[PDB]
Every structure is written in C-alpha cells, then in structure tokens.
Design a protein around this ligand. Structure first.
Ligand SMILES: CCCCCCCCCCCCCCCCCC(=O)OC[C@H](COP(=O)(O)OCCN)OC(=O)CCCCCCCCCCCCCCCCC
Ligand code: HEM
Lengths: 49, 78, 52, 53, 420, 55, 101, 446, 292, 89
C-alpha cells in the first residue's frame, strides 16, 4: 500500500534544535533562519564592500 | 412521495444531473478531472448523396469484406 | 487617462505600499551616500568623522 | 514638423544675429507644440469628425 | 416553532409557496417542467446546455455581474435536472435575498443567449459529460432509458457527441419560449416571507402566460443493449414497465423495492434483510451488490433489479436475483418483512426531507405536480395503507411483462434476455 | 532525411529572421531604410577598422 | 445642418480608404477591445472584412486604387462593428468600476 | 422581519450534561421527526506506538460484526428492523459511531450504540475476514490519488512523530495483527471520560440522559494500570516527498505549512484566507469572471484541473495550504501563481476581499449545519476539541472582528517566509525544486 | 478502423451482425476502442497456433505448376495438427439497434435468418435477392426491373435506395432489406419495401421476372470469376467451404434448377422470421420492429 | 473524359447481337425530349453540387484550369452551371 511509504531518519543530518521529535518547532525556527540569513547578510556586506 | 429523484433511494444522483453556475461555499465531494485522452484522426470529407442517381449502388447487398494491402490502400466492400 | 486608478481599493493598496516604498527609498539614499562618500552626510554620523 | 526640423537645421548653422534668434525660438516652440499639443488634438478632431466617438 | 407553509395560485398559472423558517440562510428555488422529456430528435442536448447556461448574460445583468454578485455575497446558484423538470435554486444570507431573487429570475426568465457565449460553453458541456461518464452507473442507466423507452424519455440528461458544436442560440430561445411558461412554474422559498415572494412574482414574471408546448407521451419498447468494454466487473440492469407517479401502485412498488433491497443501511454491511442479497449470498461466494431500481415518472415508470457482479459469475447472480423476484411474485413473503420494508420506506422519506435542500426539492416537486403540499404524516399514512397483496401484484406485473436489459462489462457469461 | 534549413540549431535563426519570415506584401521603399542602416553600420565598422590600422 | 454632412462627406472622400474599397470600421487599429469585437462578429461579416482588408493590401502593394464606380460611397457605408464594440466597451467599463471599488 | 445575527440568536442551545463515569452527554433539539445519535471517542491513530498502527481502523471494521448480547448479523437486522442508518469513521484523532434513525425508536438505538461501545465480540474468523477486507480496501484506496497525497503530506510533515502514521497502518501490521493487542487497545482507549454521546434532531435531553444513565453507565472508569495516556506535541518538518510515476495521466501536488491548532482563535481568520482563495474544478460554470484570482488565472491559462485549500487542525498543531491536480506541462506555473496569492494575502489584502471571504465563511458555517447528522458531528467534535459547543452567534461575533490588517498580520505570521511541506504524485518532473518553492514563499519586494 | 468506418454501410453491417447473433458471428471485423493498446503478442501467437492449423488451409495457385505447390506444401506447411478450435455455432439473437448520429440520410437494415452455404435454399435466397433488387445495372438508371425500387418510388419523390441484403455462412445466414432514405421519409420507404416483400411472399410475382433474376444471378456469378483475383478467391472459398472444386457450368445449372415455389418459400421464411434491425441517422421518423 | 467518350455493355457471350444492337441505336437514334432535358438539367446541377465536395476533383479541375489557360483543355467535362441552365435541344 501507500501507507508502507515511510520517511527514514535524518538524525545524522538535522540541526541540534530540531533533533527532538517530541518538542514542537516554531519556537527555535526564527533563530535558525536568523543564523542562516545572518550568514547571507554578512556575505552580501563583504561583496558589496 | 413525489420528487422522483428523492423517491429512488440509491439512484438519486444517477437519475438527476446537478450543476452550478456559481460555486458554493461548501466544497463538493469528488471534484473530478478529465484525463488527457486520445484524439480521433483527421480524415478528408466524403461525397454526399443529395440526388437519387448518386444513391444508386450505395445500398449494401453482400457480406462485408475488408482488404489490407501492403502498398495498396486498404479497401472494404459491402 | 489614468482615471481608472481613482478608487478606495487603489487608495488602500497605495496606503499599504507607502512604508515599503519609504524603506526602499531609505536604502537607496543610504546606498547613494555610502558609494559616493558625500560630505554632507558622513560628517554628521559620529563614527565616520575620520576621513574628512 | 518636418519643415520645422529643416528650419532648425538651417538655423543651427547660423550665428546668433538678427533675425535668427526669434526664428529659432519660434521654431523650437512650434516643434515642441506640434509634438506635444497639436497632434493629439488633431487626432481627437478627426476622431470626432469621422463619428468615431 | 416556525410558521406553516403557505401557497398561492397566481392568475397566470404560477404557483408560489413560502415557509418562514426564521432561518439564518434562505433558499429560494424555481421549479420548471422543462426537462429532457420535451426535446424531439432535432434539438437533442438543448436541456444540457440550458442547464449549463445559468450564468450567461441576461438583460440587466451580465455574466460578470451575475458571477461577481452572487460570489461576493457568499451565496450560490445551482440548477438540477431530472428527465421531467429543472430547478434553479439560489441560497444565501437573508439580507441578500433581494439581489439573489433578482439574479435568479433574470437568469431563468430572460436570458439573452448570445452566440459567442454558447460557443464558449459547448466545450464546457463536453467536459461535463466526460466527468459525468467517469463512473459506471450513469452510463448503464442512460442506456437503460435509451432501450426502455422509444420516445420522450430516451432523451438523455447529457448532450450526445454528434450534437456538440451544433446547438445554436435560436433553439435555446425556442426551448425557453416553449417550456419556461408561467403555467408550469413553482417558485418556492424557505426563509422568506410570502409578501416578498408574492410582490416579486407579480412585479417581474408577467412576461409569459401560456400553458406552453407539451404532449410528450412516452411509450415503451423494451429490448437489450450490451457494452463490451473489458471491465473485470459486470454491471446489469433488468427492468420492466410500472405505474406512474401519484398512484397507490407507486407506493406498492416503493414497498417492493425496499423489501427486495433498496441500498445499504450499515457501512460495510452484509445486507442481511435484503432478499436478493440473501439469495445471491446463499448462491455465491464473490463480492457483489444487488439492489432494486425504481424510477416512476408522471406517465410511466421503470422497476427492476440492478446487479454489479464478477465477469465469470454474472449469470448466477442475475439468475438468482430474478428467481428471488419470481419467488416473491408467487407469494413467498412474510408480513414481518413487509412491515420492515414499510418502516424502511417511512424512514427513507423522512431522512430525505431532513435537510433544507431535499425539503425544498420536495416542496417544488409537489407544488409542480399537485399545486399544494401534503404533510409528511399523510404520506406515512398512505405508506401504511398498502397491503402485501399489492406488493405481490407489483412483483407479478414486473415478472410477467416485457423487459429492458442494459449490460456492461465482459459479457461472455452474461445471459441474454431470452435465457432469463 | 530532413530539412537542414529548419532543423539546424544555427540555421534556424537565419531561417526565422531573413528567409521564411512572414512580411507584409504592401510595404513601400521606406521599409528598406532600416536594413540599409544595418548595412551602413557594418560598412562604418569595416572602414573604421582600417582607419584604426594607421591612426 | 446639411453643411456639416456635406463637409463630412468631403473629408470622407479626402481620407482615401474608400478608394481602396475599405469601410470606416475596417480602418480601426485593433486593440484588445477591437479584437474581441472582431471575435464576436458573424462569419459572413468577418469573411467580408478579411477580403476587404486583403484587397486593400493588394491595391496598396501595386500603388493603385479601385475605379471610381467601385469606390465605397458615403451612403451605404454600414457601421457594422459599432454595436459589438459598444457592448465590449460597456463590459470593460463594468469590470473597471468593479475593480476600482 | 429578522436580521442575520437575530436569526443566529434564535438557534437553540446545545444542552450538555455529565455522568458519574465522566461521559459527556450532549444534545441539540430541532423540530424534525428524525434524529442522529452518535458516540465520539478521543482515540485515533495518534495514540498508537507504531506496533498497533491499524488497531482503531480494525476495531471500526469489527464493531458492526456482532456483539456478545447480539451475536452476528441479527445486530445488523436490528438496525434494519427500524430502517436506521449505521455509519462510522476513524480519523487520526477521533473515532465516531453514529446512527441516523427516527425519534420513536430513540431508546433502543442508544442501547445498540452502548453495545458497540462495550461488548464488541472479536471472533478470530471475523479477524481473518476483516483482515482480507482491510487489505482489499487499502489496495482500492491506492487508486484514489488524493488520499495518497494526503497520507504523503502527513508522513512528510510530521516525521518521527505519531502523527505521520496513517489511520489504516502498514500492510504488515494488518498481516500480523493478533487479538490481544485489539483487546488492549479497547481497554486503554475506550474509557468513559474520553467519550461524548451526542444527539441532534427530535430528541429530549432528559430522556437521552436517562438512557445514558441506564445503558452507558459504568463503561470503564478505570485506566487498568493507573497510567493516563496523553498526547505529546508533534514536530512539524519542512520537507518534501516526490513519488514519480509517469504512467498516471494527471499529477496531484499539495503544499502546506504548519497550522496553529484547534483552540488558537486565528483559525477563524485563516478560514477567511481560504475563503479568499477558495476551490475550483472543471465542472464549474463561472469562466473568467470568478472572484478568486487563482481560479480566474487557472481558467484563463488552462492551468489546473482542480484546486482546493485546506486548514486541517489537530491538538496544538495542523496543516494549512493547498492541493491541486493538473497535467504535467502546467505544474510549475500553478505553483508560482499559488505562491503569489499567498504573498498577496501577506502584503496587500484589501477590504473587499476580506468582506467577500467573511461572507463565504458565514455561508459555509451555516450551510454545513443543515440536517441532524452534521449538527451531531459538530456537537461531538466541539465537545472533544474545544471542550464546549461553540454557538453560531459566537462564530458570527468572531467573524465580525476580522479586518484586512489582522488578516495580513496572521498571513504574515503563518505563511510568510516559512518552510512548506510538499507532497507530489504523478508526472511531477516539472514540480519545482524545494529551493525554488522556499524562495517562492517570500517576496523580494515584500 | 477510423478510415474504414467512414462509410455508414460498414457501421450498419457491424451493428446488424452484433445484434443478429448471440455469439460466434457478432464479433466485429475491426478492433473495438477499448481493446486498442491492450492486444498483446501472446494472444496473436495463441491465435496463430490454434487457428492456422493444417486441415483449415488451401494453397491456390494461378500461373504456377502443381509440383512446386506440393513441394512448398511439404516444406513450409507440415508442422501443424489440423483441427485447432471448432467454434460456437452462431446462435441467433434478434432485436434492434438505433444510432442517433445526425446524418443527412438514414440507413436501415432489417434482416432475418436464411439458409447457410450448401443448402438447397441458399440458391433460392440468392434468386430472391436478385428478384427484389441487388444492385444497379445502368449508370444513373431507374431500376425498373427491381421490385423494391419500383414499389418505393410508386409513393415517394425524394432520393433513396432500396436493395436486398444477402449473406451466407457455414452454419447460419442473413437476408433482409437495406434502405437509404431521408430523415423525414424513412417510414414510408421502409413500409413500402416491407409491403413489397410481403406481396412477393403471397405468390404475387411474375415467372418472367424470376427468369430475369436467374439471368442476373448467372451473369453476376460469371462476371465475378473472369478476373484472376476473383477466380482465385472463388477457388479458395470453395476449397475451404466444401473441399472440392465446382466448375462454373455446374453452378449455372444449379441456379437453373431453382423453382418459383422456392422463391415464394424463401420470402415467406423471411416474413415469418424473427427480425434484427440496425438503424442510423436522424431516427425521429424511423419506425420500430413491433410497428411494422 | 476531356477528349474521349465511352458507352460500354458487359454481358454474356450469348447476348452479343442484342448488345451490339443497343450500342448501335443508342449512339445513333437517341430520343431527346424537353421534360427529360429539364429533368437531367436539375440532376446534373445536383451532381455538380455533390462533386464540389470531393477535393481531389476540385484540385484536378483547378490544375487543368490553370495549366491550360485560354485553351479548350481548361474547361471541365461538366461545364459551368450557366451552360447546363442554358443548353437546349
Ligand atoms: C486645388 C488644385 C489647384 C491646382 C490644380 C492642379 C492639381 C493639384 C492637386 C489637386 C488635388 C485635388 C484634391 C485631392 C487631394 C486631397 C485633398 C487635399 O489635399 O485637399 C487640400 C487640403 C485640404 O485639407 P484636407 O487635409 O483635405 O482637410 C482638412 C480639413 N478641412 O489643403 C491643404 O492641405 C492645405 C494646407 C495648407 C498649409 C499651410 C500652412 C501655413 C503655415 C506653415 C508654417 C510652417 C513653418 C513654421 C515655422 C515656425 C518658425 C519660423
Ligand atoms: C567600431 C567601428 C568604428 C571604428 C573603429 C571607427 C574608427 C574611427 C577612426 C579611427 C576615426 C578617425 C579617422 C579619421 O577620421 O581621420 C573615425 C572617425 C569618424 N568616425 Fe568612426 N569608427 C567606427 C564606427 C563609426 C560609426 C558607427 C560612426 C557613425 C556613423 C562613425 C563616425 C565617425 C565620424 C563622423 C568620424 C569623423 C570623420 C572625419 O574626420 O570627418 N564611426 N572613426
């Protein structure tokens, strides 16, 4: 059936803030995209300089 | 018990066709979609028979016999 | 012939788009000030008062 | 408009002497007026005149 | 407690009925005796395109105005069609009923029927016929009506493929001016007072006055049709002629179909009380379903059995169902099963008039056929006044009459009508 | 076989532009002028190249 | 009065499309409104318009005009695209005033 | 005369009473001769521990196949003795057994429901037969691509949590399914304080309360281990599942974001957002004059076969998004247009669209609650989710609080710059990469 | 299939054979639309190995000696059993089919059972077919010697054609009336043809017209075998049907032995038999089988 | 055709003198009457209306018209409709 189709574990790839399947997301999600857009922002500052 | 469509129990939406021009707030069950099906081939038009002399010979009188040639066009006889 | 653009919906659309356009104008002004080294602005910013 | 462009071409090769200043000013005024004002007015006039609107 | 249903017979023949439910949303519908019963062979599929032209340009309201006006207030406009009558129903908030009735009556009285709009709409009717023929019951009931009647009821609900690209605006206007006449209109309203409906009906629908073009008089021919399409299941419908609507024999045939099995009662049920299911289940060991079909119109009806079975076991299923009906016709029935069938029929009618849209359909149908409303208690009393001898006589009329068989599937083992 | 004018990825552009381009039948001689401009442009470039060889 | 009609007739002769067999309504530059007006035309008027435009292009190619008996007269110049165009502009204005609110 | 708010005020109130067991007995009375009486149980597929995944569905199968008091099809004969309709469903969070009947047989039907509550005999031959039936209907439900896409979206949106598993479970769980685990599931998930007996239609609350005190007294009341089963939160995962099978004619794509839940009130505002976008399929008759911009664009450019928008809510979680079926050659374009509409609701939501969405939401909320069966469903799910039946007047008051500013604020809260979950099935080669979709979930012009 | 179905005679004959038989003759020449894309090569190998067996084939040669035919027969053909699968006897069904497809002309075929190949009544059915009319002899004529055309044109004034349809198989047969008429004039043409055949069945016929029909049948049979391909087709058909060659003079003298009472008996058997009708066109005025 | 005419009978060998007699008196003593003139006048009008829908015949008539312009080979066998409306005895 299509109910046999199961996603395997990604625990060897996930971030530390979303490793737990019991706690909810959307609490640390803004911190994660803040870190990623901070990396993007400082790269864009460097290339603009 | 009038309202023939409601009088027939299981065959209520089979005996009556319901459509809409303005969609409702409630989403219908079984939205449905036409799959992309095949198309019939395009053939050139044939001669009409609008006089009594052209209809002479067009009526079938024999068992139907098909013939497929290799470099001969496929023909059929009535 | 822009009398099509007179109405409450277009007014609400423009009112929604004022602060984004103002922020983009601020970005363009800061970018034109920084890339040209204008003496009318950097002499007022406290940190950048070393090259002038 | 084409003849006015020819006039401006002739005036541009002339010095700033009488009567080239007033001729050049009238030529530039008529050039901008024909491009900006009189051509849509003429278009509206023939639109009315052919019962288009 | 809401107010009683109240009727008014207008002098132009229009019948208006209103019940003040004090409902948060009002539903208002016009019922017109303009089905596919009234198409001859030269205007086939006109009723289908007229059903799909409920949002075209009218006088005073364009297509843009109609769609953007009904869609802004949240209400809806829908149209349903049997083979005998159509119903244009709008519904919405009671503060929007004035513009909703304006839109409904402008749609249903004076459509402009422009040429380019129906030229756009014909591809839509092709798509509608494809979606409607995606299932299997619709095609076999359509072929059953094609073979059961020789005229005036063999005209299908959906436009034939040869007629697509051939319906013009002139025959749509001709159909409207013949069959949308005020003597066959029932304007019914739930959630709206009689004053508003009466004033709108008197102010706007004095355009047509005549009785209209009628005189269909469908006749029975019988026979069979076979559709070899290679499905692993075989669908079969074997019917015969039966009495019309508005008669005691119609109630007898309804009691007979609820005795023989008239649809499931339990989700994934075993159909213990259905006699045909009992006979096939004691005869077979394969998945199947056997039900009883009854469609009783104003002049004639069709009653029979409908089986879906396997390709290799269609013959035993059809023979078992036919032998069960033959056993019922000979008198092999108990009074407890007749009482259970009567209770099932009463509960089925009362659940059919449960919701507001089914109730309004019942109001419009009884207003068209009779001009008044029978309360449901009188209908239950008419159900209770049927003897089992009438059920035996109805089964005997079905068995001893000529038949119409429509079959679809792998029909190698499917028996013909001479072998039943 | 095939049609090399319409199926070659380079010749398809020349076929679409200057060979099988649909054009109005009634355009006057003024419609030559822009094409002449292009020709004059490359003429200038050619002469300019040789004027770049000794200047 | 009649002077304005005679002066309009003189301008109609001075415009020159009637010497190509054209009508007034053929000379409209086709915008989206005119395109929908042509799309709503009956087939015979559409075919007549296509042939008139093709003949005008054939005459303009050869730098010639029709003979003076074949010129389109000011009297029978039927205005065939005006009601379709009027309904197209009215429906577009209805859509415009709905979208402006 | 009467206005809309007065008409919603005139709707009768749902009477709620309690038992000593903890049963919630609720009823809404109308002037109908029929009634719908059902039992709603807070036990879905979220309560299973991956080794009993198909347990509630298999109980729903065996629930109508006889009891200890009424062995076998005679039970079914009882439901066909009075002309009653016996229906059931199982969800990821709820289970319901409901009967439509008349009012005069209102005692015995309650007793029948009580039988299916607490005396469900589980014969082993019935276990094997229903195992075959479950395998048959899972292979039937594989044909319907919409349910497959729904299950794929739930599997990829809540990975590693008990909300990813399907209601029916995997096939191997159906094969090795014993009786002891069904008995354990029935013991630990069919207790009295997680049950609502709801009646709608021609009922009396005192008579129904007496019948529940007679038949539904002492259902379980005991946890049997002194271990209360609870629900941990489920982590939403922005991810993507693509099932490529080019032999299918059409492709189904669902894109969702994380929803707020049940008790969070901005649900109502989010409903208005769905009411702005709406639904469309090819059988509609609006043409290019449809109010929804997505529907008008899809009609004009012949993009999609159908689309719908959903706001599915579970206990402090949910999905919020769109699902469309279309041919392959349009898929990417449809995604683009859909994302544009979402960002329009994040940036430039106007007052006329908000008013139209509010009218559509009022029409949907009242037009759903017609007849006894959806009213009974509303009562049962309201006492199970909110803990109370929210009246329609409170829904009208909650709708009236919405203007365009809070609508675009809520849409910027939930839709803007968020990682979606994408489920695709069919010829989905032109379905864009997840980087493209995540880029399309925000605007550079804001 | 789409090319061959451009003639409405093809669709009418296919539907007529579909309605006329329960099995084993109702199978179409052309593949059905559901079967397209679903016919596998294993079914073709099954059909070849079950029906291309040795005792069901005749190798016929014109312009080539017998010894090389026997050498090819012993070389290429001798690895098959001979019987294969027999068949299902082609039971008769009856009934009608009506196809509303919107044509300018309405085609109606009304058929009944007849004699198979080899009986003494098949030649009588052929003589009756040529008596009622089975094709024109003059280009743009009027068919004065055709009874059906004269009977229809006695009361009609519109374009039409009526012929007698005849088909003979190994076990069953078909004989009836084929009419092409207008949409609003189909009932008059069908009733006129049926009344003419009913008049023939009651002995109202001329023996000189039977002699003319015999001469027409002999002429048609002799003109069907003058070409080499028609000669080869007739030799192969005779070798498959009877297993022996029949000279044409024996066929002519078998034609000459048909009595007039045999023609009356064949017409009476057609009138008294159960009918199969295939109709196509605008069928608002086309009658039904029970209305005849 | 455009340059030939044929009248042929196929028959048996026994009926040779009769078919020679019919072929002799058909091409020699053909009786023409004005009612027959108008009857096959409308018949040939309907035949030409039928032959307009066969595109191969239309194309070959076009090819003969444009390849043999101004010559008696351009005109078709049937001729235009004005002649069959104006030909007489
Ligand atoms: C009559 C012929 C006598 C001789 C016989 C020999 C044959 C000659 C040709 C005969 C032609 C017969 C008519 C057919 C041609 C078409 C009609 C035509 O051309 O008519 C003459 C035309 C009338 O005007 P029309 O354009 O038709 O319509 C205007 C609306 N009343 O009139 C005009 O176009 C007149 C235009 C006059 C423009 C004067 C401009 C004055 C100002 C110029 C300033 C420019 C420079 C500005 C510089 C500024 C700075 C210094
Ligand atoms: C890339 C291409 C070109 C090159 C390499 C080029 C190069 C030159 C050179 C070297 C000169 C100076 C030689 C001389 O005038 O004695 C010159 C002059 C000139 N070029 Fe070009 N040129 C090019 C294109 C053009 C174009 C496109 C135009 C405009 C039509 C143009 C207009 C002129 C003019 C007006 C002069 C002055 C001629 C004079 O002395 O009076 N050139 N060019």
């Amino acid at each position: 059936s299509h109910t046999d189709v199961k996603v395997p574990d990604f625990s060897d790839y996930r971030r530390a803030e979303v490793l737990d399947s019991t706690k909810s997301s959307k609490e640390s999600s803004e911190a994660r995209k803040g870190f990623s857009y901070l990396v993007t922002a400082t790269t864009t500052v460097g290339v603009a300089y | 018990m009038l309202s023939v469509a409601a009088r027939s129990g299981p065959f209520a939406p089979v005996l009556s066709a319901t459509s809409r021009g303005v969609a409702g707030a409630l989403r219908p069950l079984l939205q449905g979609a036409v799959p992309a099906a095949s198309e019939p081939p395009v053939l050139d038009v044939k001669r009409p028979f609008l006089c009594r002399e052209s209809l002479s010979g067009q009526a079938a009188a024999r068992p139907l016999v098909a013939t497929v040639g290799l470099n001969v066009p496929a023909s059929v006889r009535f | 012939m822009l009398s099509r653009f007179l109405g409450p919906r277009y007014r609400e659309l423009a009112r929604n788009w004022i602060p984004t356009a103002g922020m983009w104008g601020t970005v363009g002004a800061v970018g034109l000030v920084w890339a040209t080294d204008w003496r009318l602005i950097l002499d007022w910013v406290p940190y950048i008062n070393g090259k002038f | 408009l084409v003849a006015n462009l020819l006039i401006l071409t002739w005036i541009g090769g002339q010095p700033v002497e009488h009567p080239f200043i007033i001729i050049g000013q009238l030529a530039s005024i008529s050039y901008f007026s024909i491009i900006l004002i009189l051509m849509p007015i003429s278009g509206i006039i023939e639109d009315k005149m052919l019962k288009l609107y | 407690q809401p107010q009683d249903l109240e009727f008014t017979k207008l002098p132009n023949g229009l019948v208006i009925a209103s019940l003040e439910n004090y409902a948060p949303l009002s539903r208002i519908g016009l019922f017109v005796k303009a089905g596919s019963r009234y198409e001859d062979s030269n205007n086939l599929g006109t009723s289908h395109l007229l059903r799909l032209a409920s949002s075209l340009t009218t006088k005073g309201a364009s297509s843009f105005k109609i769609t953007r006006g009904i869609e802004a207030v949240g209400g809806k406009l829908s149209v349903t069609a049997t083979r005998e009558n159509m119903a244009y129903t709008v519904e919405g908030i009671r503060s929007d009923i004035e513009i909703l009735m304006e839109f409904l009556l402008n749609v249903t009285t004076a459509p402009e029927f422009r040429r380019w709009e129906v030229a756009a709409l014909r591809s839509q009717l092709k798509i509608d016929k494809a979606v409607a023929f995606q299932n299997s019951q619709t095609r076999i009931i359509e072929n059953l009506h094609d073979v059961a009647y020789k005229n005036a009821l063999a005209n299908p609900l959906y436009c034939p493929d040869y007629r697509m690209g051939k319906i013009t605006s002139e025959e749509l206007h001709y159909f409207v001016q013949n069959h949308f006449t005020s003597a066959r209109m029932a304007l019914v309203g739930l959630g709206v007072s009689h004053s508003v409906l009466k004033q709108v009906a008197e102010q706007f629908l004095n355009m047509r006055g005549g009785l209209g073009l009628a005189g269909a008089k469908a006749k029975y021919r019988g026979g069979e049709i076979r559709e070899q399409n290679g499905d692993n299941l075989v669908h079969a419908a074997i019917v015969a002629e039966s009495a019309a609507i508005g008669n005691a024999e119609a109630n007898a045939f309804s009691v007979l179909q609820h005795l023989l099995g008239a649809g499931p009662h339990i989700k994934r049920g075993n159909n213990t009380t259905s006699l045909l299911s009992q006979s096939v289940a004691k005869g077979s060991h394969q998945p199947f379903d056997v039900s009883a079909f009854n469609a009783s119109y104003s002049d004639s009806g069709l009653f029979g059995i409908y089986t879906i079975s396997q390709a290799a076991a269609a013959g035993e299923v059809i023979n078992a169902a036919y032998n069960q009906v033959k056993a019922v016709a000979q008198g092999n029935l108990s009074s407890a099963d007749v009482q259970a069938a009567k209770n099932k029929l009463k509960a089925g009618y009362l659940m059919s008039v449960e919701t507001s849209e089914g109730f309004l359909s019942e109001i419009g149908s009884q207003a068209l056929a009779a001009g008044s409303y029978m309360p449901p208690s009188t209908v239950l009393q008419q159900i209770d006044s049927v003897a089992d001898a009438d059920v035996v006589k109805a089964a005997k009329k079905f068995v001893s009459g000529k038949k119409s068989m429509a079959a679809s599937g792998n029909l190698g083992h499917t028996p013909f009508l001479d072998e039943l | 076989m095939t049609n090399m004018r319409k199926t070659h990825p380079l010749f398809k552009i020349i076929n679409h532009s200057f060979i099988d381009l649909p054009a109005p039948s009634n355009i006057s001689s003024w419609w030559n002028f822009g094409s002449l401009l292009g020709v004059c442009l490359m003429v200038q470039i050619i002469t300019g190249l040789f004027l770049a060889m000794h200047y | 009065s009649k002077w304005l009609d005679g002066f309009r007739k003189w301008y109609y002769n001075a415009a020159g499309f009637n010497k190509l067999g054209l009508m007034r309504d053929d000379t409209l530059h086709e915008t989206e409104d005119v395109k929908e007006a042509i799309r709503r035309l009956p087939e015979d008027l559409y075919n007549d318009r296509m042939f008139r435009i093709k003949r005008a292009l054939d005459l303009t190619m050869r730098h010639q005009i029709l003979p003076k008996d074949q010129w389109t007269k000011y009297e029978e110049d039927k205005f065939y695209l005006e009601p379709y165009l009027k309904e197209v502009i009215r429906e577009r204005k209805e859509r415009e005033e709905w979208a402006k609110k | 005369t009467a206005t809309f708010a007065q008409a919603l005020q005139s709707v009768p109130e749902t009477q709620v009473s309690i038992l000593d067991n903890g049963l919630r007995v609720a009823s809404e009375q109308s002037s109908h001769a029929t009634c719908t009486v059902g039992v709603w149980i807070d036990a879905g597929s979220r309560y299973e521990t991956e080794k009993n995944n198909g347990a509630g569905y298999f109980l729903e199968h065996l629930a109508f196949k006889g009891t200890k008091n009424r062995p076998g099809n005679a039970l079914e004969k009882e439901v066909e003795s009075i002309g009653a309709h016996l229906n059931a469903y199982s969800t990821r969070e709820h289970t319901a057994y409901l009967i439509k009947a008349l009012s005069k047989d209102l005692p015995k039907v309650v007793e029948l429901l009580a039988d299916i509550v607490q005396n469900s005999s589980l014969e082993d031959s019935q276990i094997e037969k229903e195992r075959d039936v479950i395998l048959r209907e899972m292979q039937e439900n594989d044909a319907s691509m919409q349910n497959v896409v729904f299950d794929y979206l739930h599997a990829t949106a809540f990975q590693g949590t008990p909300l990813a598993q399907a209601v029916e479970g995997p096939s191997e769980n159906v094969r090795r399914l014993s009786r002891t685990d069904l008995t354990d599931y029935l013991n630990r998930h069919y207790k009295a304080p997680r049950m609502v007996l709801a009646a709608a239609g021609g009922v009396e609350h005192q008579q129904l309360l007496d019948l529940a005190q007679k038949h539904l007294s002492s259902v379980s009341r005991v946890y049997e281990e002194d271990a209360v089963p609870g629900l941990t939160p489920c982590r939403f995962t922005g991810s993507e599942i693509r099932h490529r099978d080019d032999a299918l004619p059409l492709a189904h794509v669902a894109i969702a974001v994380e929803g707020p839940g049940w008790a969070n009130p901005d649900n109502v505002t989010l409903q208005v957002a769905n009411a702005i976008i709406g639904h469309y399929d090819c059988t509609y008759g609006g043409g290019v004059h449809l109010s929804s911009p997505l529907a008008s664009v899809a009609v004009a450019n012949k993009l999609c076969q159908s689309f719908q928008t959903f706001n599915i809510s579970y206990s402090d979680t949910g999905l919020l998004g769109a699902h469309f079926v279309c041919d392959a050659m349009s898929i990417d374009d449809m995604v683009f247009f859909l994302q544009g509409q979402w960002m329009r609701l994040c940036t430039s939501a106007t007052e006329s669209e908000v008013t139209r969405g509010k009218n559509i939401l009022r029409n949907a909320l009242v037009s759903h609650l017609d007849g006894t069966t959806p009213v009974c469903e509303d009562i049962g799910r309201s006492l199970l989710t909110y803990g109370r039946r929210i009246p329609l007047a409170e829904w009208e008051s909650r709708i009236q609080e919405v203007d365009a500013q809070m609508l675009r604020d809520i849409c910027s809260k939930y839709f803007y710059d968020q990682c979606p979950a994408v489920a695709g099935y069919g010829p989905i080669e032109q379905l864009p990469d997840y980087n493209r979709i995540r880029s399309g979930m925000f605007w550079l012009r804001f």
